Structure 1
C-alpha cells in the first residue's frame, strides 16, 4: 500500500582515529516501504544527537548501513500492535535518517564488539518541556547524557563533603553535569579540558582546578599537575578519557575511592592500547572501579526521578545544561565533526534539529 522517499547518512568508509566525517559519511536517497507489520510504526525524525561515542559505533557499522544515533521521533503511523500511536513523540536509537520503520523493541547490536541491545523506544511527555527546558533536552540533560551523570552520582558514587572529585573530559555535557553535582555535594572538583576557553568555561561552572590535557604528552607532567590540583589525593574519578590522565589518577587514589569508567577517548579515538598496569594501584586503597553503561538505567522509574530531581535544578538555573542545536539534515556530519575540533564553539550537547 505504499512507499516514500527518505534520506539517510550511511557509512561509506571505516576510518580509525579522529573521524573525517566528510569522508566517512554519504547522504543517500532511500525508498522506505511504508506498509507496517503488526507491531511496527513509521517514524519521522525531529532531532538527532551527535556524540563522540558514535566514533566506535561507526567503526562497527557495516559499510552501507545508516549511522545509528540517539534521536527524537514522531510517530506518523502505527500498525495494530504498536507500542505508540500517531502523534506520539518518542526517544530511541533511530539514527541519521529522516524517516524509518521500527517496532521500537530492544534490539541486539549484532556487529558490535560487545553484543549490546539498544533499549526499547520510550515515550516523551510534552508537559515536561517548555522554554527553559525544551524538547531537545530529551537528548541531553533529560536524556542519555543526563541519565548517565545522574545515575552515576545517585546509584554508584557517594560524594561526601571534603572529597576530591576528578572529572576527565569535563568539557562535554556528562562531565559538566558530574562536576556540578559533585560541587553541590561539597566536593572539590578537578576537571580536564583541551583549550583555555574550555578551561575558563569549567571554572565559571564551579570546577576548582582545570588541567589542560595538552600536557598528556608527559605522564609525569600530568601527574604533577594532578598532584598540585588535588593535593589531598583523589576520592572519586569520573573517567571519559583514559590514557595518561587516568594513569596519573590511579597513582594517587585515596582509601575507599570510587572510579566510574564511562568512556576511554584515548584508547577509542587516539589508539592508546598499551600502558602502565592500573590494577596494582587499587589494592591498598581498596578502590572500586565500575564501568558505566547507562542503558541499564533506562526505566520508567528512573526517567521520572531524573525529571523531578534534575529538571527542577536546570529550570531554576542551579544546574547549567548547555545545548548547541544545529539546523538541517544535510548538516549532521558537519555538526558531528565539530566534536573533535580543538577550536571549540560547542557548549554542552551538540544536536541537530531536522
Structure 2
C-alpha cells in the first residue's frame, strides 16, 4: 500500500571499450510507487544475469536510468487485469534493481541503434526446477543462453557426423553448450578459451581442442593454430568474437559450411571496426552465414521444447551447465567486471542472487 524503497544501479557515465564497472554504474535508493495499474505488478528480484552484451545496452542507456539485465523476479502485488498473480516466479528484463513495477508486456527499446523489443515476461514453474535443475537456471541453460545454443543447433545448424566445428568464446556457457551438442551429434569440436585452466575445463567436456587467443593476437598466428586444430577445414562456426579469429576461419571454410554469428566481442568491446573483407571467401565454399538473435525464439512452445529436450539430458549429468552465482545485490557491477578481467576464476554462467 503506497510506496517503498528500492535500490538501483544507474548509468553514471558512458565509457566505451572494456567497461570501467565502478565508474559507469552508481547505486542509488529510489522510491517506487506501489499503487498499481489495471495490469501492472510489483516484483522483487531474486537473480540477475550479467553478460558481456550488457556493454552495448549500457552505451545506449540514458544517464540515470537503471541498467537493464536479464532477471528472475517474484510477484509481490498484482493489478486486477494482471498477467500474473502474486507468488508467481517470472523471468524477464527487470535490470539491476532490487524491486520494480511492470505490466510485463513486451516493450520497445527506443534508445537502441536497432529497434529492439524486449519480450513479455515468461512465467516459471518451480516443479520444473530441483536440486539438479535449480530455479537459478531459468537465466542459463533453462533460460537465455541455453535457448541460444539449443536454437542454433536445432533450428539452424545441421551438425553432421564428421564435421570440424569451431566455437569462438567457448568458455562461456553458450560456447560450451554449443560444443557439447556438436560432439553429441558426433562432430570434432574445436574451441577457444583464454587461460590454460579454462582450456582443461572444455577439454574435460569433450573439446577435442582449445586455443589461446591471448597467444594468438594476429590472424596469422591464429590461422596457424587453426589449420592444425582443424586439419580438414571448417564445417560449422559459432562466432562471438570476430576481427582476427574470424578472418582466419573464413580462409578455410569447407563447402556447405554454416556460420552462426552470435556476437562480435572484437568489434563491440575492443572496437575493431575495419578488417579484411570476408564476403569474397564465402562464395566458392557456398557458406551460409546467419545472424543470431535468440529473442526470435522466446515462444511458449519453444520454452517447453528446451525443458523437454534439454531439461532431461542436463539432469542426467549427460549435459554440463555450470553456473557461478555471486551473492549480494551490491556486488553486481563487480560481477560485471569479471567477464572482462577476472574471468579465469569464472565457470559457466555468471549470475548474482539478490
SS of structure 2 residue aligned to 1:343:
coil
Cα distance between partner residues in 2 of 1:82 and 1:184: 42
Q: Give 1:243 shift.
A: 1.2
Give CA deviations for 1:295-316 in whole Å, capped at 9, x if unaligned. 1100111110100101111101
Q: Give 1:202 shift.
A: 1.1
Q: In the superposition, relative to structure 1, how do residues 281 and 292 fare at CA in structure 2: closer, same or farther (>3 Å)?
A: same
Give CA deviations for 1:319-348 in whole Å, capped at 9, x if unaligned. 110001111101111111111115511100
Cα distance between partner residues in 1 of 2:83 and 2:119: 14
Which residue of structure 2 lines up, in the alignment, with residue 202 of structure 1?
202
Does the 8 A contact of 1:194 with 1:342 survive in 2? no
Does the 8 A contact of 2:3 with 2:35 survive in 1? yes
Cα distance between partner residues in 2 of 1:219 and 1:51: 26
Cα distance between partner residues in 2 of 1:145 and 1:333: 20
Which residue of structure 2 lines up, in the alignment, with residue 302 of structure 1?
302
Does the 8 A contact of 2:194 with 2:344 survive in 1? no
Does the 8 A contact of 1:173 with 1:348 survive in 2? yes
Cα distance between partner residues in 2 of 1:214 and 1:127: 43
Give CA deviations for 1:163-188 in whole Å, capped at 9, x if unaligned. 01100000000010000010000000
Cα distance between partner residues in 2 of 1:343 and 1:293: 24
Structure 1 residue ranges without an equivalent (≥5): none
SS of structure 1 residue aligned to 2:211:
strand
The count of corresponding residues between Structure 1 and Structure 2 is 354
SS of structure 2 residue aligned to 1:243:
coil
Structure 2 residue ranges without an equivalent (≥5): none
Cα distance between partner residues in 2 of 1:210 and 1:330: 35
Give CA deviations for 1:59-104 in whole Å, capped at 9, x if unaligned. 1111100000000000001111111001100000010000000001
Cα distance between partner residues in 1 of 2:218 and 2:86: 56
Cα distance between partner residues in 2 of 1:260 and 1:137: 24
How high is the TM-score relative to the length of structure 2? 0.99
Cα distance between partner residues in 2 of 1:351 and 1:292: 23
Cα distance between partner residues in 2 of 1:60 and 1:194: 29
Does the 8 A contact of 1:159 with 1:187 survive in 2? yes
Cα distance between partner residues in 2 of 1:217 and 1:172: 20
Cα distance between partner residues in 2 of 1:60 and 1:264: 17
Q: Give 1:198 shift.
A: 1.3
Structural mapping, 1:29-178, within 5 Å: 29-178=29-178
Does the 8 A contact of 1:195 with 1:342 survive in 2? no
Q: Which moved more, 1:337-346 or 1:216-225?
A: 337-346
SS of structure 2 residue aligned to 1:212:
coil
Does the 8 A contact of 1:257 with 1:288 survive in 2? yes
Give CA deviations for 1:243-292 in whole Å, capped at 9, x if unaligned. 10000001100001000000000110000100000100111111100010
SS of structure 1 residue aligned to 2:38:
coil
Does the 8 A contact of 1:256 with 1:286 survive in 2? yes
Q: 4+ residue stretches of structure 1 with deviation over 2 A?
A: none
Q: Which moved more, 1:173-182 or 1:333-342?
A: 333-342
SS of structure 2 residue aligned to 1:209:
coil
Cα distance between partner residues in 1 of 2:293 and 2:215: 29
Give CA deviations for 1:205-253 in whole Å, capped at 9, x if unaligned. 1111111001342211100110100000000000011110000001100
SS of structure 2 residue aligned to 1:7:
strand
How high is the TM-score relative to the length of structure 1? 0.99
Does the 8 A contact of 2:39 with 2:81 survive in 1? yes
Q: Give 1:20 shift.
A: 1.3
Cα distance between partner residues in 1 of 2:317 and 2:343: 27
Give CA deviations for 1:112-145 in whole Å, capped at 9, x if unaligned. 1111000000100111000011000000000000
Does the 8 A contact of 2:239 with 2:264 survive in 1? yes
